[PDB]
Amino acid sequence: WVTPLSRRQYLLNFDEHGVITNAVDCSSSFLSEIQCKTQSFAPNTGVYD
Amino acid sequence: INSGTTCSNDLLYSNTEISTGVCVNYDLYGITGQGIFKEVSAAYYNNWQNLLYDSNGNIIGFKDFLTNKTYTILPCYSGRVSAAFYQNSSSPALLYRNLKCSYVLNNISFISQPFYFDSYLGCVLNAVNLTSYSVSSCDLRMGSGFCIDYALPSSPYRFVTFEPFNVSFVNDSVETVGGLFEIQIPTNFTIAGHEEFIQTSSPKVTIDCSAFVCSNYAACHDLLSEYGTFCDNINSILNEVNDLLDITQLQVANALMQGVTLSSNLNTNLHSDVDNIDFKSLLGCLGSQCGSSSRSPLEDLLFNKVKLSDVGFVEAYNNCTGGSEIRDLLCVQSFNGIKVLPPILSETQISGYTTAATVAAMFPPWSAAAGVPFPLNVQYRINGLGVTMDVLNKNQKLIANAFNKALLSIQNGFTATPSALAKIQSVVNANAQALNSLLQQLFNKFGAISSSLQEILSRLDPPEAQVQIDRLINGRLTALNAYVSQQLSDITLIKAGASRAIEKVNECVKSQSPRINFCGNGNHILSLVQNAPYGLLFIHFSYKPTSFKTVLVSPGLCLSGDRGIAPKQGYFIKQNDSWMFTGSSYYYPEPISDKNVVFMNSCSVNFTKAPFIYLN
Amino acid sequence: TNFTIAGHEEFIQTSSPKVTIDCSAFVCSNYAACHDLLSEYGTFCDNINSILNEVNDLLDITQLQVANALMQGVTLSSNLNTNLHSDVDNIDFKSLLGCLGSQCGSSSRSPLEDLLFNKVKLSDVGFVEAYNNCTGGSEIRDLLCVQSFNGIKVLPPILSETQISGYTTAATVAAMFPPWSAAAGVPFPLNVQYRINGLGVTMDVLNKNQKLIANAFNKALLSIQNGFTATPSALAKIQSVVNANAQALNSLLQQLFNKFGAISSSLQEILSRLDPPEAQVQIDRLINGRLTALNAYVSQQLSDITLIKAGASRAIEKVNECVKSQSPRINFCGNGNHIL
Ligand SMILES: *[C@@H]1O[C@H](CO)[C@@H](O)[C@H](O)[C@H]1NC(C)=O
Numbered sequence A: 001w002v003t004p005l006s007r008r009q010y011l012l013n014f015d016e017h018g019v020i021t022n023a024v025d026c027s028s029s030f031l032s033e034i035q036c037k038t039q040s041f042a043p044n045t046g047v048y049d
Numbered sequence B: 001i002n003s004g005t006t007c008s009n010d011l012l013y014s015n016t017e018i019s020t021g022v023c024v025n026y027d028l029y030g031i032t033g034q035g036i037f038k039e040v041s042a043a044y045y046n047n048w049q050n051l052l053y054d055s056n057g058n059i060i061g062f063k064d065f066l067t068n069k070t071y072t073i074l075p076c077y078s079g080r081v082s083a084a085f086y087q088n089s090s091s092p093a094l095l096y097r098n099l100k101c102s103y104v105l106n107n108i109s110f111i112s113q114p115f116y117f118d119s120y121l122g123c124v125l126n127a128v129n130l131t132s133y134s135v136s137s138c139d140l141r142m143g144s145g146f147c148i149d150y151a152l153p154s155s156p157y158r159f160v161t162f163e164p165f166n167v168s169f170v171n172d173s174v175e176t177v178g179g180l181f182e183i184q185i186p187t188n189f190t191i192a193g194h195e196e197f198i199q200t201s202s203p204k205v206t207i208d209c210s211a212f213v214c215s216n217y218a219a220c221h222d223l224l225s226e227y228g229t230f231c232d233n234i235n236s237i238l239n240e241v242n243d244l245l246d247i248t249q250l251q252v253a254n255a256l257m258q259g260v261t262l263s264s265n266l267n268t269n270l271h272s273d274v275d276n277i278d279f280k281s282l283l284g285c286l287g288s289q290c291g292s293s294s295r296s297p298l299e300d301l302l303f304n305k306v307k308l309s310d311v312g313f314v315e316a317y318n319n320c321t322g323g324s325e326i327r328d329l330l331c332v333q334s335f336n337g338i339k340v341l342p343p344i345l346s347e348t349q350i351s352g353y354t355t356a357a358t359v360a361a362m363f364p365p366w367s368a369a370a371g372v373p374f375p376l377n378v379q380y381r382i383n384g385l386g387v388t389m390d391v392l393n394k395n396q397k398l399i400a401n402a403f404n405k406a407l408l409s410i411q412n413g414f415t416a417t418p419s420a421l422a423k424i425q426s427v428v429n430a431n432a433q434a435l436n437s438l439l440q441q442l443f444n445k446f447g448a449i450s451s452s453l454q455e456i457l458s459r460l461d462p463p464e465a466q467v468q469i470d471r472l473i474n475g476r477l478t479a480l481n482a483y484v485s486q487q488l489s490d491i492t493l494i495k496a497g498a499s500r501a502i503e504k505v506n507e508c509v510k511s512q513s514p515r516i517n518f519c520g521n522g523n524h525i526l527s528l529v530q531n532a533p534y535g536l537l538f539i540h541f542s543y544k545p546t547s548f549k550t551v552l553v554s555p556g557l558c559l560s561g562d563r564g565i566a567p568k569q570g571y572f573i574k575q576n577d578s579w580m581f582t583g584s585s586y587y588y589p590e591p592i593s594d595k596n597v598v599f600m601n602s603c604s605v606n607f608t609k610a611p612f613i614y615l616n
Numbered sequence C: 001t002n003f004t005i006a007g008h009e010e011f012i013q014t015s016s017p018k019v020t021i022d023c024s025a026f027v028c029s030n031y032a033a034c035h036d037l038l039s040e041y042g043t044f045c046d047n048i049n050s051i052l053n054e055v056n057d058l059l060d061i062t063q064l065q066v067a068n069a070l071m072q073g074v075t076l077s078s079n080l081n082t083n084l085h086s087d088v089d090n091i092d093f094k095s096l097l098g099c100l101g102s103q104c105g106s107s108s109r110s111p112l113e114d115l116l117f118n119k120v121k122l123s124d125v126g127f128v129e130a131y132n133n134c135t136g137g138s139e140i141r142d143l144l145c146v147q148s149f150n151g152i153k154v155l156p157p158i159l160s161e162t163q164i165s166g167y168t169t170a171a172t173v174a175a176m177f178p179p180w181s182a183a184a185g186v187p188f189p190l191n192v193q194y195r196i197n198g199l200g201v202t203m204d205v206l207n208k209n210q211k212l213i214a215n216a217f218n219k220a221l222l223s224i225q226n227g228f229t230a231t232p233s234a235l236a237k238i239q240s241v242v243n244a245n246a247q248a249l250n251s252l253l254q255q256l257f258n259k260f261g262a263i264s265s266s267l268q269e270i271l272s273r274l275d276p277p278e279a280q281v282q283i284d285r286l287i288n289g290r291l292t293a294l295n296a297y298v299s300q301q302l303s304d305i306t307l308i309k310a311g312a313s314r315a316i317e318k319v320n321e322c323v324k325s326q327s328p329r330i331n332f333c334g335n336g337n338h339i340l
């Protein structure tokens, strides 16, 4: 498999040991933008602009 | 530049027709930009003028030279989109305001969305049309009385109507059925208990410029001292806010204990029950056979769920130099100059004030009920609503049972999530968020080489580092000014709420004011006050009817001799071919007396004639 | 020796237009080369975006409080005013009543409120009807579309004007028909007689001058209704609030045309004349100036929301202690002799 690359910004999650477990691309969809704005993987219920 | 006729043949192109109705980028004879063109007939163009400017210096219209036509330029669309997202959903519901769905699916978005519909606010995506269904409360309010509800199953979101309040409907007539009116009168009643929380104080925060802008560097202080007294005003405003909070707390403490007189033979730990009413959950220590700390079970239950209390900040700041766990977000703020100071009065003496204020309404000389015992006081209060005294004097155990049941229900309701604890947590959450937002400003570059004084210092010479330090200084000063402005904006609402709390304590707890719809919801009887983290908790008791009965009444009669009578807080019923009097809140018939109605030397034609009432 | 009943009108401001400002679309540019420099300032837009959210939340909370104060302790009959006679004892109250029956939907404004809502243009529905015309083509000299394209918008409240008008008119019919929830169970003329007896007038004169009281009420209502043709003190504040809001919006929008020490007020000219190595020096001045302007605006909003809340609390207290009940406090609900 092959896929192209580009300079993008991601939100990464580190566990207690130091291994990356979760990653979110902040330019994929609207949920990703909400998670990037809140800097969390489980944002609260609400209406965002 | 970018306006003229001397073109360049370096990068040449081909002339194209001016398209209308599309957001395109133009290169018209030098002037560039993006917009939509529209053809319009104009007759205000001379031979020396070909472009139209606005009052601020913007191209709004122009005229072509090759076609001799006039066009008008309009800017393209640029706006945001609302996204309603639930707790653990997979895709939020989208809402484009003031835009129809026939415009966003072919000019803005190109994704095949199988769910889309127009509304009064605009276009909604990933939702269904369920306007015909109402809802009491919502968490995602859009506007104009519309809400979005998440239902676990198409689209899990539902676009419904928001109706927070209704009106009670009673199936009765409105017209006069033979000169009488059909009204519902209660038959069986009870005592209900409500609770509310009013914020009084605010956390006292102190900031120091000697550690926020310049931590310990001398070259930073040399540039900070050039501005002058720009940092003294911050400390002055903080001290003024702290003094205002202290004065407010002292005024509240004075309003709590004002005229209270208690007996010296009460410190026995046994005088806690009167009229078979349990008040152990409201009273604490009163005397000398206790320790330093003393609260009530309700106050303890309220404080056990709030960690950032008065003693919480002290216990957190104490664990900063030990070595157990210094990774908390409290010591890092104290190491930079932001410190929370405790108030003058502690949460223990205010508990004693509330306990004394509660006892003042239980035992002689009854300094909180004008010298009237508690059962007689509550009986007079419930009689003032328009009930008979006989049913009150005959049923005294039911009143105490209802009081005990309401108190137990209020005590048990704290296990759930009410609005009082919600606000008590929200205030401290907002305070913590403000502190974190103020602390995060120390890691911003503010248009410099690095967001750190050491990296700027040990990378260049002072002549090239002065500007880099000045940028950070200006940024941090602006942040401090914004924080001071926010604190000054919040202290006003804090003081207003505290004044309202003082007024409610003075006119609802210590005294029984005749102001209706002030201490309760029209049927208010009494209220009690307790302490709570950063505020007071008011427990009100109200008169709640249970059963009802329809009855025909008449608002006054006409006696014999051109004289009229009118009821006082009641009605006239016709029972057993005779006119009797009933209360406005109970259905105990009683004969008409002198001290029950009001007389008048003339009666109108609307009153019902009854010349057989010889009760003079 | 002889008396009459006079009428007076007062206006109390309760709400305010919720203004929302977009950061990235206003302070730097609508382009993309400015965001790479704007991201160097850190999280500066978060405070500006949160202040407006807190102000809007406070406005929603106080609006819900006003609604609760208007809709508390109201019990009406099922056979409501369905084209029923809106007069009680020769007292015409049709001018201040809408419709609350099974029919007559999507419209609940009274004829009195129509005269007030027709003299203003920037109402709750005004912004909605003026913002959806920018796509299909609005007026060429329209400023609202430009303000919306620059990131300045006005959001509607959580409750529409029709719902508030219905909640208000549901309280007027309370003390007109059984049961009288707004008069503690006392009929309207008997309540008026009781409230006017407290001044000193005996019942012998009141029981013989009921038609006089009815005619006085009708004449006062007609005069209050006709006084809207001129410019009274009530409409003056309503117009002044909108004028001040529009002036503030225009002053905030005008900041985009300043130089702030740079060579031009538009980034299109700067990016078409200089290179990136000599562009940040010019863009930083504009960024700082617009950030200072936004900070001043949010500070003014935080300063005005306090007075807004104070006025709303005053209105709530007046509603709770003047119309829905009879408070024995002189010189509070009116100018001395208060009857209703
Ligand atoms: C939207 O798209 C349609 C068809 O693609 C086109 O005819 C119309 O001019 C477009 N409108 C705008 C404002 O771009």
Ligand SMILES: *[C@@H]1O[C@H](CO)[C@@H](O)[C@H](O)[C@H]1NC(C)=O
Pocket: B065, B066, B067, B068
């Ligand atoms: C446009 O108007 C000018 C002014 O008379 C004229 O000289 C020129 O020929 C016109 N061009 C066209 C294409 O009609």
Ligand SMILES: *[C@@H]1O[C@H](CO)[C@@H](O)[C@H](O)[C@H]1NC(C)=O
Pocket: B134, B135, B136, B164, B165, B166
């Ligand atoms: C109004 O009615 C709805 C629907 O029955 C209900 O959910 C809501 O709790 C009611 N509100 C009040 C204040 O009675």
Ligand SMILES: *[C@@H]1O[C@H](CO)[C@@H](O)[C@H](O)[C@H]1NC(C)=O
Pocket: B187, B188, B189
């Ligand atoms: C009122 O209700 C209580 C509890 O249901 C009952 O014990 C009492 O007898 C009732 N009184 C009347 C008058 O119905």
Ligand SMILES: *[C@@H]1O[C@H](CO)[C@@H](O)[C@H](O)[C@H]1NC(C)=O
Pocket: B274, B275, B276, B375, B396
């Ligand atoms: C009535 O007197 C008895 C006898 O001491 C007492 O226990 C009870 O609490 C009193 N009740 C009231 C309402 O005073």
